Amino acid sequence: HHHENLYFQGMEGYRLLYPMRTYLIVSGHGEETNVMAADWVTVVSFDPFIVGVAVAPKRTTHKLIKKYGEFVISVPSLDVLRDVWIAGTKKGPSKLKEMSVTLIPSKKVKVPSIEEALANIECRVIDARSYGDHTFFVGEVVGYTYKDYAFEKGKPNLKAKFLAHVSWSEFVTFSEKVHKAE
Amino acid sequence: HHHENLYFQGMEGYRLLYPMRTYLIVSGHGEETNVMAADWVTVVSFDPFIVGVAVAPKRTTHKLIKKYGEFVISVPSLDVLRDVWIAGTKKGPSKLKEMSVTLIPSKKVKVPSIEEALANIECRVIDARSYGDHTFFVGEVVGYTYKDYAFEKGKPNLKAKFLAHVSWSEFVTFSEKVHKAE
Ligand SMILES: Cc1cc2nc3c(=O)[nH]c(=O)nc-3n(C[C@H](O)[C@H](O)[C@H](O)COP(=O)(O)O)c2cc1C
Ligand SMILES: Cc1cc2nc3c(=O)[nH]c(=O)nc-3n(C[C@H](O)[C@H](O)[C@H](O)COP(=O)(O)O)c2cc1C
Ligand SMILES: NC(=O)c1cccnc1
Ligand SMILES: NC(=O)c1cccnc1
């Protein structure tokens, strides 16, 4: 498989950063609630806590983030891969009927959270910049929830099976073997 | 351990996105060549290939990226953890004497590449935005090199031991067990 619009066949340059974590991005609310898959997510500030996500203009998610100015980063486990794949292949709110997700209210944003997620990070858009073929939406974190066990020791519990993306349809989780640097 | 300037003790919010990949950021050149550790790295565009990295103003790396307008993202393996830890704990160019790294010329930028890295992604700064306590440096990718075996099948070779960060001094790599979504 290759990314769409790869005119010169070869490995996509971005693959040099892989494997990357895979998250879900929830946008909209009510009948407009949507979810997509997103790898291109990072933290951009500690205090205040701010995150960013690169979203192509053609995503339905892009329209919904522009319209409402809010999004939720929901953290999936490997056990919900089938739902992550639907989120990353089907288009728009009608896909939710196909997904094993239970929408629950957020603490602060109007966009819902996903009950099955390991964490839900509630974001308000503070910037949108166009870089190449994506918009980088920067979100101030205004709330969050998480599954106690997934972060039981004030750090990620590797038993929770955090999801990473290797290539097109190939995913993995982490080893449970921790290496200490100090 | 907690991040510096965590006034209210508890798990840092950003930890909800962890584990995250750990990269190295090379900046400067000559006697000013520097390397630091960076987790807060993502892709922001496919075509053209553009990346971003969140760097605190207090990093020596910040000064060097501002001065020269270029940086290299070098991808470490778990086998070079000791060097990654020096990059992420010591300050400025004098740390290189302590690291098992061989600097080699980049293809395009003046900042050197690291021979031992799995990949070296050469970047020219196209934007710098302040979000909270970090600058988000956005870099257009103008060249790259990589170890053939690490990406042998036009995708990451999990045998290469790509590095991820769990908590302060704790690191892991990926399982080699691939899950197919399609
Ligand atoms: C694992 C995976 C990761 C993805 N990461 C991104 C991403 O970071 N940004 C993006 O714009 N699209 C990404 N996509 C593509 C969207 O998830 C996909 O186009 C989705 O169908 C869009 O749905 P929507 O139109 O309902 O927003 C990803 C897809 C997959 C399968
Ligand atoms: C694994 C790890 C990841 C890190 N990620 C970041 C990061 O994304 N951004 C940042 O500004 N500092 C990050 N740091 C902190 C810098 O690497 C660290 O402060 C380093 O000593 C700065 O070196 P310098 O002053 O030579 O630039 C990280 C540190 C470690 C150990
Ligand atoms: N173009 C994209 O945004 C993208 C990112 C990761 C996987 N597939 C597509
Ligand atoms: N403040 C930071 O930039 C940072 C990121 C990851 C680990 N330690 C510090």
From Swiss-Prot, chains A, B:
Keywords noted in UniProt: Flavoprotein, FMN
SMART domains: Flavin_Reduct
A family per Pfam: Flavin_Reduct
Keyword Flavoprotein: yes
Required cofactor names: FMN
UniProt cross-references to InterPro entries, sorted A to Z: Flavin_Rdtase-like_dom (IPR002563), Flavoredoxin (IPR052174), Split_barrel_FMN-bd (IPR012349)
Disulfide bonds: none
GO molecular function: FMN binding
Family the entry assigns: Belongs to the flavoredoxin family.
Entry-linked PANTHER family: FLAVOREDOXIN, FLAVOREDOXIN-RELATED-RELATED
Name of this chain's protein: Uncharacterized protein PH0856
Classification lineage: Archaea, Methanobacteriati, Methanobacteriota, Thermococci, Thermococcales
